[PDB]
């Protein structure tokens, strides 16, 4: 404690109590013998950056390539490409989820991510806005964003997308400043398809945060469509 006090003197010298105590100790001793960024001088501001890629084996990692292309990678082999686009690739109204489950050919982790995304959308109420293709075990899901902006399919989908690819997703978004938290883009479709692994993260670092945060959103804001769930 004495040595610690000796090495921490400059920060305590300013206190008048500390000066008084030092003077008293010195007087008692004498009478007895007679008979690059710096802070507070000693603290250097340093930084670290986390390598989220190391988590790839146990949790999904989202990142953004550019305004239109975003990815959620699962492991080192597979993932989902999420593209905001004006070019639709499905021109029918089916989403044959039941048959896809019965055939059981798809990646189970990817189907889990799709389920989490869809269940997280607030107030989804136009089933015709969602089209899908799961033939052969593939995953292809197309959300129609075409049209107050708050009570629209486009807004709910975009809110979920903003969370799912949080970090880098904003550059596609905030283009039409809506009421409250409501989002609007010029894009007509959001497309989600399975892809192979590739280093796509030019715009934002890979990150599990959006997905992990979205887990608690599942079912919070769905509507009832029947009396017995």
């Amino acid at each position: 404690q004495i040595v610690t006090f000796f090495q921490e003197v400059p920060h305590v010298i300013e206190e008048v109590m500390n000066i008084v105590l030092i003077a008293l100790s010195v007087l008692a001793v004498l009478k007895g013998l007679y008979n690059t960024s710096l802070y507070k001088g000693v603290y250097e501001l340093q930084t670290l950056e986390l390598n989220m890629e190391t988590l790839n084996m146990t949790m999904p990692l989202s990142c953004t390539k550019n305004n239109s292309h975003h990815y959620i990678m699962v492991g080192n082999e597979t993932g989902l490409e999420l593209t905001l686009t004006n070019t639709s690739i499905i021109n029918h109204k089916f989403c044959n989820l039941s048959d896809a489950h019965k055939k059981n050919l798809y990646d189970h982790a990817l189907m889990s991510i799709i389920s989490t995304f869809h269940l997280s959308i607030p107030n989804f109420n136009q089933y015709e806005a969602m089209s899908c293709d799961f033939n052969g075990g593939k995953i292809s899901v197309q959300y129609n964003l075409s049209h107050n902006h708050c009570g629209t399919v486009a807004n709910g989908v975009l809110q979920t997308f903003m969370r799912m690819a949080w970090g880098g997703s904003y550059i596609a978004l905030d283009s039409g400043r809506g009421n409250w938290d409501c989002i609007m883009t010029s894009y007509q479709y959001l497309i989600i398809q399975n892809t192979t692994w590739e280093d796509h993260c030019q715009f934002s670092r890979p990150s599990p945060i959006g997905y992990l945060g979205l887990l608690s959103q599942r079912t919070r804001d769905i509507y009832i469509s029947r009396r017995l769930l």
Partner: antibody
């Protein structure tokens, strides 16, 4: 280097079924709109329709009731089936590869690779 | 449905002269137009896409311009192998449309 090799009989009697096919040799089958166009003599280019590798389709409404388009991704081919041919279906028929860019403004679309074409006369 | 009208119907110009071809949409376009050259006996050939970009192998003589409803194709100093029919072309989602076409003649 991409080629679109076209096949199918162009000689038909009225009310028969025109059945043309086009095989793609080069580059991917995914990410394109495989398109059928026709040019009847004395007229300009007319879009018959198009299809993806997901077998999603779009058709000209003036022919929608009679046109079917299909894909076979195993052999990288796509097919046009037109029914109840009348003299109005005499034309040169083209298969073409379309590409649509909708990721940023300005969006664009084109038909860059075309087949040779088939003369389809009915009488 | 977005439709296209090409002007003029026929265009008579001397070799080495500048040629301007117009395409008028009926609405503000869903995508920037494409321009094809078509010669009798052969398939149409893609000249311009996105209203301003030259396709592969297209000489720098061909240029394009336009926005909204008005689009133009320009040939600066046309060569004798340029006299053909020219089509503008638009696509909305799952709907492709052409113009009637302009015949460029000597």
């Amino acid at each position: 280097q991409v080629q679109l090799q076209e096949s199918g009989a162009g000689l038909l009697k009225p009310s028969e079924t025109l059945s043309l096919s086009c095989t793609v040799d080069g580059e991917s089958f995914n990410g394109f709109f495989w398109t059928w166009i026709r040019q009847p003599p004395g007229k300009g280019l007319e879009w018959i329709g198009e299809i993806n590798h997901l077998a999603s389709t779009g058709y000209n409404p003036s022919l929608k009731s009679r046109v079917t388009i299909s894909v076979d991704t195993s052999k990288n081919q796509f097919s046009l089936k037109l029914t109840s041919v009348t003299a109005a279906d005499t034309a040169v028929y083209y298969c073409a590869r379309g590409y649509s860019y909708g990721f940023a403004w300005p969006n664009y679309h084109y038909l860059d690779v075309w087949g040779k074409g088939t003369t389809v006369t009915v009488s | 449905e977005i439709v296209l009208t090409q002007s003029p119907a026929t265009l008579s110009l001397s070799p080495g002269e500048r040629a301007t071809l117009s395409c008028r949409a009926s609405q503000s376009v869903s995508s920037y137009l494409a321009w094809y050259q078509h010669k009798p006996g052969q398939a149409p050939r893609l000249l311009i896409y996105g209203a301003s970009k030259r396709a592969t192998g297209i000489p720098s003589r061909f240029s394009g311009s336009g926005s909204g409803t008005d689009f133009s194709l320009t040939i600066s100093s046309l060569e004798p192998e340029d006299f053909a029919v020219y089509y503008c072309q638009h696509r909305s989602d799952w709907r492709t449309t052409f113009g009637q076409g302009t015949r460029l003649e000597i």
